[PDB]
Amino acid sequence: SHRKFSAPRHGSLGFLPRKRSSRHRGKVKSFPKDDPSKPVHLTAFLGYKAGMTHIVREVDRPGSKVNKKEVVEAVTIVETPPMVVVGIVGYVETPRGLRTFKTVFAEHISDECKRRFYKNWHKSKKKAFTKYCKKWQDDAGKRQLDKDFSSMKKYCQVIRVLAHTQMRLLPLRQKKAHLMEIQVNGGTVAEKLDWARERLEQQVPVSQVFGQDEMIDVIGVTKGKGYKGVTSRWHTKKLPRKTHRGLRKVACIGAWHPARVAFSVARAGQKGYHHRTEINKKIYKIGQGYLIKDGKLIKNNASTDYDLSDKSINPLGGFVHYGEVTNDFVMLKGCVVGTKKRVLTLRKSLLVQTKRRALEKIDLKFIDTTSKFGHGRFQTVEEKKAFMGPLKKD
Template structure:
């Protein structure tokens, strides 16, 4: 928590820290810090955030994440990260077509569910006493505890999951202006040359129009519409 959340509060986040970049002594200290990183650090990570104003979502708060910089020497990593400070990093500069990536996210939630729905255990015969969507035996007499691996009722879905090896079919460019004209053609292929946008008629259900750069992956991804996903190389 960096600043006061009260409505009347005049305090703003990072007001003192940002003066470091304007002050001469502060600039010297920053140069010192960057050179110390190049000398002593082995791993360089950058803090990045999403741009919520570009999305058709109600949420304003950005998602903040620390991402490790790989490739090259430590000095090159620090220089690269420094020139990217406070700048937009496009998806084209990170991923490429036909690349295999991992998708990390939270699955679709289903709330409290019984054992048959949650673990796909076999239903008991029709005439079973006290219900048939149950597990008949939940363990031996001894050990006199219910083991962790026994199927039980409880929360289903809304779990953090990582799915490996999803192929990037296309990296699409968002709607942009070229030579004074708005270019929306980002869905045509070698077989279908008609100029069209990736957004279907009426927009994607529960999302809206896609106006920014996009990724098209093979297969499905975890979670509901509008779910935030982490793409990992």
């Protein structure tokens, strides 16, 4: 006998192995598909979640009732010190998949990157890549090496690069810089590898991977939340107040006979810290860091064209629970996964993007700095003194 009236159901039945993710950095499960027509470029990159604030813009979309009017849309701030290549890595095509073929490293690998090979840097003689480099300046290691760069040049078809972050430049406690494979999509593998080598030990900035007003996809790990109940985890109906042993439950587990209990049904357990891949997050501006010149330091990030004050995206008292943002940044409309301080893999889209809500070019008119630690009313410290006069300290 049957269900008297119908509903729909509680939760998504693809996402269901609701376990605490095996990895702490978002894995890219799938990069795009290349076409030898277009020139070389990296695909992915690395940032850190540092904040959230307002904007204000004057909108064009002909048709709707918000045309040439001024909305406010919200944003996140992702901080992006430019990344440093240290190697290449070749993959081959097969009938059991994609076997990894040969790996090489640069002569000079930093100590934030010699920090990525250890569980303990305190006791260890830091001996990784000590015998390896050696090869890069003897006349019997220019040939063996370029035997092999001439072996990828034949056999391999997929080519990738490898880049360590820069945690000498972030305001965090830690010092262990993230190694991350990245696909290089473009010309025939000959060209693809003429470009790579040439970049070992160089810096690659965010101007080069991404551009303004783009549609990127955002990969990471969730804000975690503890072994939580069935009412918080799955979003069921509470029970009515008279129930003998509790009312934040499912009251019927299963029927009598197919006498098991099915993975379909909702249960207690761990809430959050899953892995997750949201899409189609826009880019409203790519920021510039604190460049010094001619004595003075220049720090106008937030300076829009429509108010030209001296301020950077940084708010009064700093961003909360994080730091100050000096290094060049990207400004995402909408919210993104993870806590503050947590590391956020980027990516292009797979899907070739033409609608109208894609091709919408953006320029802004306001960017928020009023302290988030409280309930702010002042845009910049100097403006305060001017409103308030001198205090009993002066």
